[PDB]
Design a protein around this ligand. Structure first.
Ligand SMILES: N[C@@H](CCS)C(=O)O
Ligand SMILES: N[C@@H](CCS)C(=O)O
Ligand SMILES: N[C@@H](CCS)C(=O)O
Ligand SMILES: N[C@@H](CCS)C(=O)O
Ligand SMILES: [K+]
Ligand SMILES: [K+]
Ligand SMILES: [K+]
Ligand SMILES: [K+]
Ligand SMILES: [Zn+2]
Ligand SMILES: [Zn+2]
Ligand SMILES: [Zn+2]
Ligand SMILES: [Zn+2]
Lengths: 371, 355, 373, 370
């Protein structure tokens, strides 16, 4: 069966898997805060079933449920991803992410050592390809890519940045160029922002590559959460993260729109990150079913654009069984006492004194009737 | 292991499981429209793991994933076996469920209806379920027929109706609905589906009062939707334009469900569960909210914290500051869809200026 | 020049259009102080009061309500004179109003003292408005009918009834029996809720086999989030009500609905500006036979826009567009509804809740820690 | 009585008046569509009284209710504006706006209006509501020949004029043409307006040119506008009610304008007399006095401190009103709207359509087969 580059170079669509840590937190197996993957040893059956759900939804990639006991967890996670990839038309991808910010670790040699430790496990397990994901600094992302290409395996690289660029101020087009130069054959974005914002960022990255005359496959794994209110830091800074994000979750129609837009933009590795559940992955695969020539196994429990409803007893329910209905319906929040957007949080008693001095001037103007 | 009545007669809280057909639809194993449970045979591994998630979240009841190239009998037998396997992995009972006869499948007389319930009861007796639930009834008449059939089993019967404060679809009010169910033999009554927790508990209150006026005692049960439905009319969420594929925004947070669980408890509800939309973290929220009353946490709480406490070691001070009940309890969360309304209306049925 | 009286118009089946909300409109213009809401402008700036009465006249109003309250008496005499002046410039009558007062003997002497000026000034009819207790409203009506002039009576209550718990039906019945020839509601609630209340009032009269004309002067503010106490208890009252203001289309909807319910004196209270009154008159123009003078600076359902350069603006020039457009708030960081304020719990009820909360907090912390162990 | 430049050169705040055509449309005197000011002859009492409300609210400028009958309307409007200006500490500004075609032909239209303004001896001239900086520069060139000060404001946002000229450049060109006051009016809410004025100011600093700054934004919230401004919003002009600023919103604007170095602080469509009062109240400590309309008001809700209900009294503070996220009262309606616009060509819509149609037909047969 085909490897990752053989698929992409043949013009195929590679469907990603969804958001493991977020989905498993909801199912009771991951702890928000650490977000660590010990479930791979503690409850492998849960991890295995979620891989299998994504595979059934049409995923071509099983990302390893791994992190930086210890290597026992990582090895176990690799073995589960392998078992499931082998049950269908999927590859295993070993990922690395930016190093933790609460660690002292920060030199090039030491940051690279961290990436090498993780790669060790992935080489021994013989993963199909490698992903450098979840990088806010392109500098650090370049080091990860430099380290991983050495393996002799294809390397994808995604950054968690939006249109404003990385956390130094490096614009996305430039970030993309830098990653391709370091040897990444697949580039794009993951996490932090919704699909709309994510694709704006990938457009900039592609435009960076088009000027500069470089070739690279394009990749997107956005949040399944609507984040029109995000600043450049992404969704963590929203007041609702992580336990109040429910209202923002994409419908399967939102994701069909994303998958079409992504495809139209030239993205051929089309996936999703936090908030993506199996039905969201199926949406990608259904939207692009005519281009691929087939539906995923999960579509046997679905219908095109609500067709499963076309014999409901209620006329107004049957009338929903059309693309035009679902594509255009402005769904309600069910929370009329709540706002539709939030201001991101971010970074004194002198201001309270100044306030108090001004309050008193106005009070006096009014009380002295100075009209 | 204590039976359902021994628990409830002792003043204990019985946490229900969540919404199987909605949860499995999202995971790829149930088709919206028929909503049938053939996964119990085709993908028992998916069904088993979802029962296990609810058990881990604190559920004391595994509802059989039942209904009605594969027969109803086959599915139902397989569903019972899976529910039992997982009930035996913790402090849980198996409930054999029947619901109203399906709306897409023929008009049935009282006799024809009762045969249908008898066919399902035969499996539940063969498998020795712990108790029986008649749920998803919109008409009290049919609900009563189910209860009359089920109580012949010798096992306890719970009965819940998918109705709101205005009553059943023939216009019978909830108080009277509750009275007729208890008279038919049900020892637990309440509501499930169609309405959010707030509306559901309004309905349960009217049921309680009807029982009090009738001098009748029965345990109270609530399995509401996890979806906010302040815009529903008496027909319930099916008539919302967003049913079933646009309901995402309305999904309750865990905090919303904690609030539900406390309200429920205060009203006198002691079988506290959930229906369509309830995922495992939602069940965890019931169990956490009522942990002081019960004396323990569910296993899933090991991958959680009280009211955001898991965030108390985050790098960013503003994320750390979210680690408190006061924060989450009061945070009015944003929809993320500013081009969209907050409520939807349910579906149903010149020349003077020239001068 | 001779002019049909209020009952002559109503008995003949005609639509009487009210004026809008004086205190609110004049507060926005700089002549009334929110808090007291008193009408000293009638002497301090009579030109402002005159011009607002004129605007309502031009919009279609058949009633100039006097801009009156409980110097003092000279303010009320001046207000009556201005209302008279303006009523005489068009097809309008002067209505002298009395409101609830901040002992039966002692309260009726407040109303009597008010009625004196209205009799001296020879108002066309009398209005008992803004009453939250039907008991006191009936006293006003009793005092007022003794003038021999027609008396309308409106309550600021919703579908749950008056502040002593008396339902709207019973309220209407009582008021007709005390001698009111016109009854209904004003203020506190939006047009939708207001018409629910009138419908109950109506049903109450029918059940009593009584007869009276029906009137409505609702808020121009949307209040889906009100409780029985009305808009004052909303967190936004009175300086944050902007978003809630009705469009002229909302008011046309209201006018048709009121007409269809049997309301024949159709006006408005706080928030109604002149273009809202124009909406009532434009909506019921087929029924009345004519348009008000202000329609000369308007068009039916956006027709004035049909000459815009941009095609999308021109497409707005019809009824189906404005009738179905779900207009945006422009405030995405804000909610769509607010919880009304009210009596809290007692201190100490609250301090007891806090102590329990703190106990429970520690019980939860210990439970999580012990499981963790 | 000090003229416009004497006030501004001395560092004083000049408070503008509000939005005449919109306010008078609501009162029954102006027709939406033509938006013409014939009320100046038909109902002078209505125009006069609105001028008087703005004066009472603190306005230091009465803008003439004028347009391009005709000269008679404009003569009457000038006389009414002067009458009211003479009743307080206010000046009369003669306005010219973009024409509804060659340079000298456009300049004839400006010259014809300037003739009335010179005959009436206005205090200063305003070229306002221009979408092309080229036309605005022509206005300014014609108007400066009067020998009176000229202000120039454009109805553009941060993305610049309709020929793509950005705001920094627009400003520099208006000041080079002889405008001593520049800024923006209309089309956008106050937040977006001040973003534009910030760019204008930066353009002047970089070109080393000096001018006084002026802002006359909408009183409507327009976070959903594109660069064409509010006319393209689906609600323009009969559904804009929900968006209207509170007096607190305008106090926030007045403070931000001031901190940016704006000293001619006014408003455009949607500004009513209480919005102007809000500018004057916010800036009252910097000016040393309150407008006369504040006699019928209080600081930040203090007029409520005597209400019968404790929760109403509790509203009588800045901390309350400044932080209250007021509700829309329309839960079945959205918070924003997509602007209307040209969209895509007829043939592209044709293409896009059949492409989408085809996809859906293929999907249908994939489902039927598997
Ligand atoms: N591949 C990871 C991304 C976390 S940002 C997951 O699926 O959880
Ligand atoms: N017990 C069923 C109720 C569906 S209304 C379920 O869990 O899906
Ligand atoms: N007639 C009065 C009612 C105030 S509630 C007014 O128009 O202001
Ligand atoms: N000065 C004009 C500007 C409208 S864009 C007015 O006040 O109406
Ligand atoms: K993924
Ligand atoms: K359940
Ligand atoms: K009125
Ligand atoms: K102005
Ligand atoms: Zn992620
Ligand atoms: Zn359900
Ligand atoms: Zn009122
Ligand atoms: Zn304007």
């Amino acid at each position: 069966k085909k490897g990752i580059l053989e698929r992409l170079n043949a013009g195929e669509i590679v469907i990603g898997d969804g958001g493991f840590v977020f989905a498993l937190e909801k199912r009771g197996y991951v702890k928000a805060g650490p977000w660590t993957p010990e479930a791979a040893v503690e409850h492998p059956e849960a991890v295995r079933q979620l891989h299998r759900e994504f595979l059934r939804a049409g995923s071509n990639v099983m990302q390893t449920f791994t992190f930086y006991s210890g290597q026992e967890v990582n090895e176990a996670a690799c073995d589960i991803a392998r078992q499931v990839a082998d049950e269908g038309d999927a590859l295993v991808a070993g990922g690395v992410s930016q190093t933790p910010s609460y660690l002292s670790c920060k030199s090039e040699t030491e940051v690279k050592k961290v990436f090498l430790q993780q790669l060790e496990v992935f080489m021994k397990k013989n993963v199909d390809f490698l992903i450098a994901e979840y990088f806010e600094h392109v500098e650090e992302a370049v080091w990860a890519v430099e380290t991983l290409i050495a393996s002799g395996k294809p390397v994808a690289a995604t950054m968690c940045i939006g249109p404003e660029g990385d956390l130094h101020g490096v614009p996305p087009g430039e970030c993309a160029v830098r990653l391709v130069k370091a040897g990444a054959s697949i580039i794009g974005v993951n996490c932090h922002f919704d699909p709309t914002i994510s694709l704006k960022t990938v457009k900039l990255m592609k435009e960076g590559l088009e000027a500069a005359q470089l070739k690279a496959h394009l990749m997107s794994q956005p949040l399944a959460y609507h984040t029109p209110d995000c600043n450049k830091q992404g969704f963590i800074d929203l007041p609702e993260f992580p336990f109040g994000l429910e209202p923002r979750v994409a419908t399967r129609w939102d994701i069909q729109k994303y998958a079409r837009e992504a495809y139209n933009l030239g993205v051929r590795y089309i996936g999703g990150c936090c908030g993506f559940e199996p039905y969201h992955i199926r949406a990608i695969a259904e939207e692009l079913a005519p281009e691929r020539g087939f539906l995923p196994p999960a579509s046997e429990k679905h219908g095109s654009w609500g067709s499963g409803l076309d014999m409901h007893t209620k006329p107004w329910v049957r009338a929903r069984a059309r693309k035009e209905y679902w594509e255009n319906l402005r769904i309600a929040s069910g929370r009329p006492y709540n706002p539709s957007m939030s201001k991101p949080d971010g970074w004194a008693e002198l201001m309270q004194q100044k306030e108090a001095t001004t309050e008193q001037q106005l009070k006096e103007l009014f009380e002295k009737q100075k009209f």
